[PDB]
Design a protein around this motif. Structure first.
Motif, PDB file in Angstrom:
ATOM      1  N   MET A   1      -9.785   9.501   8.779  1.00 44.67           N
ATOM      2  CA  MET A   1     -10.856   8.560   8.478  1.00 44.67           C
ATOM      3  C   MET A   1     -10.485   7.650   7.312  1.00 44.67           C
ATOM      4  O   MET A   1     -10.093   8.126   6.242  1.00 44.67           O
ATOM      5  N   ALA A   2     -10.605   6.342   7.547  1.00 40.27           N
ATOM      6  CA  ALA A   2     -10.370   5.305   6.537  1.00 40.27           C
ATOM      7  C   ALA A   2      -8.964   5.339   5.932  1.00 40.27           C
ATOM      8  O   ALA A   2      -8.787   5.019   4.762  1.00 40.27           O
ATOM      9  N   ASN A   3      -7.975   5.723   6.736  1.00 39.29           N
ATOM     10  CA  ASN A   3      -6.574   5.754   6.312  1.00 39.29           C
ATOM     11  C   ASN A   3      -6.208   4.520   5.489  1.00 39.29           C
ATOM     12  O   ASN A   3      -6.329   3.400   5.982  1.00 39.29           O
ATOM     13  N   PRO A   4      -5.788   4.724   4.225  1.00 43.18           N
ATOM     14  CA  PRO A   4      -5.419   3.612   3.344  1.00 43.18           C
ATOM     15  C   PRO A   4      -4.401   2.635   3.941  1.00 43.18           C
ATOM     16  O   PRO A   4      -4.553   1.434   3.760  1.00 43.18           O
ATOM     17  N   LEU A   5      -3.384   3.128   4.642  1.00 47.14           N
ATOM     18  CA  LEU A   5      -2.372   2.226   5.197  1.00 47.14           C
ATOM     19  C   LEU A   5      -2.976   1.301   6.250  1.00 47.14           C
ATOM     20  O   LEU A   5      -2.814   0.075   6.174  1.00 47.14           O
ATOM     21  N   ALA A   6      -3.692   1.884   7.210  1.00 44.58           N
ATOM     22  CA  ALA A   6      -4.333   1.108   8.270  1.00 44.58           C
ATOM     23  C   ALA A   6      -5.374   0.145   7.702  1.00 44.58           C
ATOM     24  O   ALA A   6      -5.444  -1.015   8.115  1.00 44.58           O
ATOM     25  N   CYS A   7      -6.168   0.613   6.746  1.00 39.91           N
ATOM     26  CA  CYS A   7      -7.176  -0.245   6.121  1.00 39.91           C
ATOM     27  C   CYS A   7      -6.547  -1.417   5.367  1.00 39.91           C
ATOM     28  O   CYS A   7      -7.053  -2.538   5.444  1.00 39.91           O
ATOM     29  N   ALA A   8      -5.443  -1.161   4.662  1.00 38.55           N
ATOM     30  CA  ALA A   8      -4.753  -2.203   3.899  1.00 38.55           C
ATOM     31  C   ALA A   8      -4.233  -3.308   4.806  1.00 38.55           C
ATOM     32  O   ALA A   8      -4.399  -4.492   4.501  1.00 38.55           O
ATOM     33  N   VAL A   9      -3.620  -2.932   5.926  1.00 41.16           N
ATOM     34  CA  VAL A   9      -3.105  -3.909   6.887  1.00 41.16           C
ATOM     35  C   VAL A   9      -4.259  -4.680   7.528  1.00 41.16           C
ATOM     36  O   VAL A   9      -4.167  -5.883   7.750  1.00 41.16           O
ATOM     37  N   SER A  10      -5.357  -3.971   7.813  1.00 35.23           N
ATOM     38  CA  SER A  10      -6.540  -4.600   8.391  1.00 35.23           C
ATOM     39  C   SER A  10      -7.149  -5.642   7.446  1.00 35.23           C
ATOM     40  O   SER A  10      -7.515  -6.727   7.881  1.00 35.23           O
ATOM     41  N   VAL A  11      -7.254  -5.302   6.159  1.00 33.00           N
ATOM     42  CA  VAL A  11      -7.732  -6.246   5.143  1.00 33.00           C
ATOM     43  C   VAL A  11      -6.906  -7.529   5.215  1.00 33.00           C
ATOM     44  O   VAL A  11      -7.461  -8.625   5.307  1.00 33.00           O
ATOM     45  N   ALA A  12      -5.586  -7.379   5.212  1.00 37.20           N
ATOM     46  CA  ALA A  12      -4.678  -8.521   5.270  1.00 37.20           C
ATOM     47  C   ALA A  12      -4.844  -9.309   6.564  1.00 37.20           C
ATOM     48  O   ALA A  12      -4.829 -10.533   6.549  1.00 37.20           O
ATOM     49  N   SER A  13      -5.022  -8.607   7.681  1.00 39.66           N
ATOM     50  CA  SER A  13      -5.187  -9.273   8.971  1.00 39.66           C
ATOM     51  C   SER A  13      -6.482 -10.081   9.041  1.00 39.66           C
ATOM     52  O   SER A  13      -6.492 -11.220   9.521  1.00 39.66           O
ATOM     53  N   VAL A  14      -7.575  -9.486   8.568  1.00 42.09           N
ATOM     54  CA  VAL A  14      -8.875 -10.148   8.578  1.00 42.09           C
ATOM     55  C   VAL A  14      -8.874 -11.342   7.623  1.00 42.09           C
ATOM     56  O   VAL A  14      -9.343 -12.424   7.988  1.00 42.09           O
TER      57      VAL A  14
ATOM     58  N   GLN B   1       0.817  -1.213   0.000  1.00 47.86           N
ATOM     59  CA  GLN B   1       0.000   0.000   0.000  1.00 47.86           C
ATOM     60  C   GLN B   1       0.854   1.269   0.000  1.00 47.86           C
ATOM     61  O   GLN B   1       0.536   2.243  -0.690  1.00 47.86           O
ATOM     62  N   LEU B   2       1.943   1.244   0.762  1.00 52.45           N
ATOM     63  CA  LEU B   2       2.854   2.380   0.870  1.00 52.45           C
ATOM     64  C   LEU B   2       3.404   2.794  -0.497  1.00 52.45           C
ATOM     65  O   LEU B   2       3.641   3.978  -0.756  1.00 52.45           O
ATOM     66  N   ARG B   3       3.587   1.808  -1.368  1.00 50.40           N
ATOM     67  CA  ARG B   3       4.103   2.024  -2.712  1.00 50.40           C
ATOM     68  C   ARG B   3       3.139   2.839  -3.575  1.00 50.40           C
ATOM     69  O   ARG B   3       3.574   3.578  -4.458  1.00 50.40           O
ATOM     70  N   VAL B   4       1.839   2.714  -3.310  1.00 53.33           N
ATOM     71  CA  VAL B   4       0.821   3.357  -4.152  1.00 53.33           C
ATOM     72  C   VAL B   4       0.166   4.618  -3.558  1.00 53.33           C
ATOM     73  O   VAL B   4       0.029   5.625  -4.252  1.00 53.33           O
ATOM     74  N   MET B   5      -0.242   4.542  -2.292  1.00 51.69           N
ATOM     75  CA  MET B   5      -0.976   5.623  -1.636  1.00 51.69           C
ATOM     76  C   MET B   5      -0.878   5.482  -0.125  1.00 51.69           C
ATOM     77  O   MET B   5      -1.394   4.522   0.452  1.00 51.69           O
ATOM     78  N   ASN B   6      -0.222   6.444   0.515  1.00 50.36           N
ATOM     79  CA  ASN B   6      -0.125   6.452   1.977  1.00 50.36           C
ATOM     80  C   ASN B   6      -1.447   6.831   2.630  1.00 50.36           C
ATOM     81  O   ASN B   6      -1.908   6.172   3.570  1.00 50.36           O
ATOM     82  N   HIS B   7      -2.064   7.879   2.097  1.00 52.92           N
ATOM     83  CA  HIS B   7      -3.276   8.449   2.655  1.00 52.92           C
ATOM     84  C   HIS B   7      -3.842   9.449   1.698  1.00 52.92           C
ATOM     85  O   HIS B   7      -3.097  10.120   0.981  1.00 52.92           O
ATOM     86  N   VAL B   8      -5.169   9.524   1.654  1.00 53.64           N
ATOM     87  CA  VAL B   8      -5.880  10.651   1.040  1.00 53.64           C
ATOM     88  C   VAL B   8      -7.040  11.010   1.955  1.00 53.64           C
ATOM     89  O   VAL B   8      -7.537  10.160   2.692  1.00 53.64           O
TER      90      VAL B   8
ATOM     91  N   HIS C   1       4.768  17.246   3.449  1.00 57.22           N
ATOM     92  CA  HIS C   1       5.923  16.924   2.606  1.00 57.22           C
ATOM     93  C   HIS C   1       5.508  16.241   1.330  1.00 57.22           C
ATOM     94  O   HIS C   1       6.351  15.698   0.611  1.00 57.22           O
ATOM     95  N   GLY C   2       4.210  16.254   1.034  1.00 56.50           N
ATOM     96  CA  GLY C   2       3.669  15.473  -0.073  1.00 56.50           C
ATOM     97  C   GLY C   2       3.555  13.991   0.256  1.00 56.50           C
ATOM     98  O   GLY C   2       4.093  13.520   1.258  1.00 56.50           O
ATOM     99  N   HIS C   3       2.854  13.257  -0.601  1.00 59.14           N
ATOM    100  CA  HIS C   3       2.652  11.824  -0.414  1.00 59.14           C
ATOM    101  C   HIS C   3       3.849  11.042  -0.865  1.00 59.14           C
ATOM    102  O   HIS C   3       4.548  11.448  -1.793  1.00 59.14           O
ATOM    103  N   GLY C   4       4.101   9.913  -0.209  1.00 58.66           N
ATOM    104  CA  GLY C   4       5.171   9.005  -0.630  1.00 58.66           C
ATOM    105  C   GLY C   4       6.534   9.661  -0.729  1.00 58.66           C
ATOM    106  O   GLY C   4       7.279   9.416  -1.683  1.00 58.66           O
ATOM    107  N   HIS C   5       6.857  10.513   0.243  1.00 59.34           N
ATOM    108  CA  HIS C   5       8.195  11.084   0.343  1.00 59.34           C
ATOM    109  C   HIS C   5       9.164   9.977   0.658  1.00 59.34           C
ATOM    110  O   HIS C   5       8.943   9.217   1.600  1.00 59.34           O
ATOM    111  N   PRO C   6      10.253   9.861  -0.126  1.00 60.68           N
ATOM    112  CA  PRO C   6      11.192   8.748   0.068  1.00 60.68           C
ATOM    113  C   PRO C   6      11.734   8.607   1.495  1.00 60.68           C
ATOM    114  O   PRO C   6      11.874   7.486   1.980  1.00 60.68           O
ATOM    115  N   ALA C   7      12.021   9.724   2.163  1.00 63.02           N
ATOM    116  CA  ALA C   7      12.534   9.682   3.532  1.00 63.02           C
ATOM    117  C   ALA C   7      11.493   9.130   4.505  1.00 63.02           C
ATOM    118  O   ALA C   7      11.828   8.394   5.433  1.00 63.02           O
ATOM    119  N   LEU C   8      10.232   9.476   4.276  1.00 60.78           N
ATOM    120  CA  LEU C   8       9.160   9.069   5.176  1.00 60.78           C
ATOM    121  C   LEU C   8       8.737   7.623   4.913  1.00 60.78           C
ATOM    122  O   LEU C   8       8.507   6.861   5.855  1.00 60.78           O
TER     123      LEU C   8
END
Ligand SMILES: O=C1C=Cc2cc(N3CCN(C(=O)c4cccc(Cl)c4)CC3)ccc21
Ligand SMILES: O=C1C=Cc2cc(N3CCN(C(=O)c4cccc(Cl)c4)CC3)ccc21
Ligand SMILES: *Cc1c(COP(=O)(O)O)cnc(C)c1O
Ligand SMILES: *Cc1c(COP(=O)(O)O)cnc(C)c1O
Ligand SMILES: [Cl-]
Lengths: 428, 429
Positions: free
Chosen positions: A313-326, A76-83, B62-69
């Motif tokens: 609300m509905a943070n993509p990272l937390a939701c992604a890990v939760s999907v995997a856990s469930v 998930q981190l590779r695509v979208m951390n949060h929106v 810092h924007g999304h997907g900052h390499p350091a973060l």
């Protein structure tokens, strides 16, 4: 930072749960790693491996650093951390909502994500209050519960916590005044339910909801009650038109031996909260589910909306890990796993019943409890368990564990042996 | 799930912030990626990149997907995802606590970690109430604020939100009754502070704390006020023995041109809340800081402890990315960066002043606001900005942005142009 440097910074600057600053009886122990069922802790300047018998406060159901959950996060981190969830939606939220609606008690069709259990309880109360206001009955604004409960630390959540355990004496004139039935007993007694109904009857016109932890009460005393009481609650709530809310923040996701504790009674609440084990103990996340009827009534009401919306609300990272856990839980024979774990706890704790300072020994799913005749001194209990290679945190008079589901039979018996030895020392 | 499948699941099952189920005027837009200052959104089945002008609700500094973060998270994941904070401590918590006590206004010596801004506000109130109870004054249990504020959605936090914005009329007989001063003005007027003082003086014996957002009021109306008002609050609170709480959950970490908005006034609160940008928009985390005096008084009180402790308190993963985010901010010339952003916002939005429907244009650090004379039509404004490559979220009569600090001049030009165009469309009815 060195462990010594961490301790110095901690003592000066860090609050801990229900702690002081500068008046701690014992320094916290430095944790430096966690893998599987094991924590690496610093003791006398040396790293030691100990079993996480508490699942890091109910969270670590699959153990720490599980490959499937680690990978779910990094994928998930590779695509979208949060929106922001205001005006946007995403796949992790949709996948998790779909899963939760499918697996929770029948009728729970909508999902409100938040960042913690306490917030999820406040959301549940808000749903209930907005529901009745949507029905033109704003007088229905109080909550009813039984004693011995715990629902979190925010101010509304506090109001339905056990008055003694929640130290309501310190909160005179501050907390909302709620309706409390006596402690729900372990064994089924029709007289208790009759009394509960009689009390509710006197308040029905001012009650929005009954809110309880189903089957197992956690932080208020690790007490278990007969699932038949939940049947009765469902019946009483139906007849008196009071919503039923189940707080499954501790009981969810297999912990009591059913997928949700409500399942022990086949009962569906109107509103349900989940949290602690939702992400497999990686990240803070909670959810409040409600029926279509509740959702529609709120949506047709004066606000035309539920008046709540957390930043993350509905943070993509937390939701992604939760999907995997469930999915990880559902993809295995979890029921057999918990049954085996419960049998291990029962077998391992049996010898404690004969100890002079032990009042009760009880097991429910992956939860084992030794109830002692005196408050347990943490200054003795903690190092005693560490000496036996186990991380244990007693509270009040209770020596208890809720181990990761991945614990081997040998690891369970190591945990129970440490518990028995702690209980033996309590009576010394 | 495909975007179409996501929409179907979402419509049936997902609540959104301050939303309905089944009565939404417009479906939410499917987001499929986020990188730097850009979101990838699905528009008519196709992925399009648009500028995250809102920083995903103040979070993405810092924007999304900052390499350091990204790296900080991945690094911590390999060591320790989480352990309970009851009886244990760890390096990410210690590192973050040390950083926060160092960079926040002077005197804030202790740090209580929680999982959201609303919780951090309730912790702040709990600190204040336990403080006075530890001084033998349980009557000091009410809060005072000025109108126009926002402090979160939990029930105590609601009680100090603006009565209009917070829909208090729908919460009759539910919320704690707090003390509200009038809306704090933009320009400094000593008469306002004198009136605030007189009102507080009458209530001093029942007040635990004054709680305000410093310099910028966010969700309650994107209003700015002169920092000198905060100087006055510090003085009033000192003289009348009421604690001062600054809610910097939106203003923190450089957003208003100072590291914390309190720094514009050169004053320290007794208690402070931070949150939205703490982890650089990766994960939910918040903190409540208080003075040694507050901490010691609570600890010597009847409970001998602060009666609060969230499950995920001081989560290693969230703390690790926060340390990285704070160090990334401090390791660059952030002050110059925000000044440049403010200049870009001012230059880009200046043309809107002349527009028929525009009543005000205001900029404070990396925050730009166009205020209109009528409500902004969301069904029209949202696609209008998207058509111009920008994600904007207007509310009421306000078209505003709080863009990532990493935005280039060209990107700020793009954001401001879209904002001006949205404001132009407002005037055409
Ligand atoms: O994407 C989002 C993540 C959180 C969020 C909130 C949010 N809100 C909450 C605050 N708000 C209010 O009107 C409001 C409400 C109550 C009191 C007060 Cl004072 C103003 C506007 C909508 C919009 C979008 C997002
Ligand atoms: O590691 C931890 C992460 C959270 C946490 C909480 C915690 N608590 C909270 C609940 N608690 C109570 O005594 C309590 C308090 C209020 C009401 C009620 Cl009913 C019981 C024991 C201490 C201990 C350890 C941790
Ligand atoms: C822990 C718990 C909560 C509160 O969750 P937090 O994440 O600590 O806010 C609420 N209800 C129950 C039953 C719990 O066990
Ligand atoms: C968003 C916000 C809060 C609440 O934070 P959540 O993380 O949404 O609970 C509190 N105070 C201020 C000033 C905010 O902007
Ligand atoms: Cl490696």
């Amino acid at each position: 930072l060195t462990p010594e440097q961490i301790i110095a910074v901690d003592g000066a600057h860090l609050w801990h749960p229900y702690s002081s600053i500068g008046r701690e009886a014992v320094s916290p122990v430095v944790a430096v790693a966690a893998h599987g069922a094991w924590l690496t802790l610093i003791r006398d300047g040396q790293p030691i491996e100990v079993l996480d018998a508490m699942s890091s406060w109910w969270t670590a159901i699959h153990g720490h650093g599980h490959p499937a959950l680690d990978q779910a996060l990094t994928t998930q981190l590779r695509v979208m951390n949060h929106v922001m969830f205001g005006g946007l939606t995403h796949e992790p939220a949709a996948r998790l909502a779909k899963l939760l609606v499918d697996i929770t008690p029948a009728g729970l069709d909508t999902v409100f994500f938040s960042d913690s259990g306490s917030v999820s309880v406040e959301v549940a109360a808000k749903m209930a209050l907005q529901y009745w206001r949507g029905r033109g009955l704003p007088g229905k604004r109080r909550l009813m519960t039984w004693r011995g409960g715990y629902h979190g630390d925010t101010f509304l959540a506090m109001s339905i916590c056990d008055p003694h355990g929640g130290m309501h004496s310190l909160w005179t004139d501050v907390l909302a005044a709620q309706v409390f039935a006596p402690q729900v007993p372990r064994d089924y007694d029709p007289a208790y339910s009759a009394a509960f109904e009689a009390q509710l009857a006197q308040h029905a016109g001012e009650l929005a909801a009954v809110v309880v932890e189903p089957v197992v009460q956690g932080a208020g005393g690790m007490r278990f009650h007969d699932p038949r009481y939940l049947h009765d609650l469902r019946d009483i709530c139906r007849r008196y038109e009071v919503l039923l809310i189940f707080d499954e923040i501790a009981t969810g996701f297999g912990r009591t031996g059913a997928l949700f504790a409500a399942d022990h009674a086949g009962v569906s609440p109107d509103i349900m909260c989940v949290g602690k084990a939702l992400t497999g103990g990686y990240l803070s996340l909670a959810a409040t589910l409600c029926t279509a009827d509740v959702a529609h009534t709120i949506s047709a009401g004066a606000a035309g909306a539920l008046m709540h919306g957390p930043t993350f609300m509905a943070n993509p990272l937390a939701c992604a890990v939760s999907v995997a856990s469930v999915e990880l839980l559902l993809g295995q024979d979890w029921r057999t796993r918990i049954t085996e774990l419960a049998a291990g706890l029962t077998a391992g704790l049996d010898t404690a019943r004969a100890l002079p300072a032990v009042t009760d020994v009880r097991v429910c799913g992956a939860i084992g409890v030794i109830e002692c005749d005196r408050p347990v001194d943490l200054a003795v209990a903690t190092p005693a368990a560490l000496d036996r290679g186990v991380w244990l945190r007693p509270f009040r008079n209770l020596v208890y564990a809720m181990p990761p589901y991945i614990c081997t039979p040998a690891e369970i018996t190591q945990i129970t042996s440490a518990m028995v030895e702690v209980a033996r020392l309590v009576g010394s």
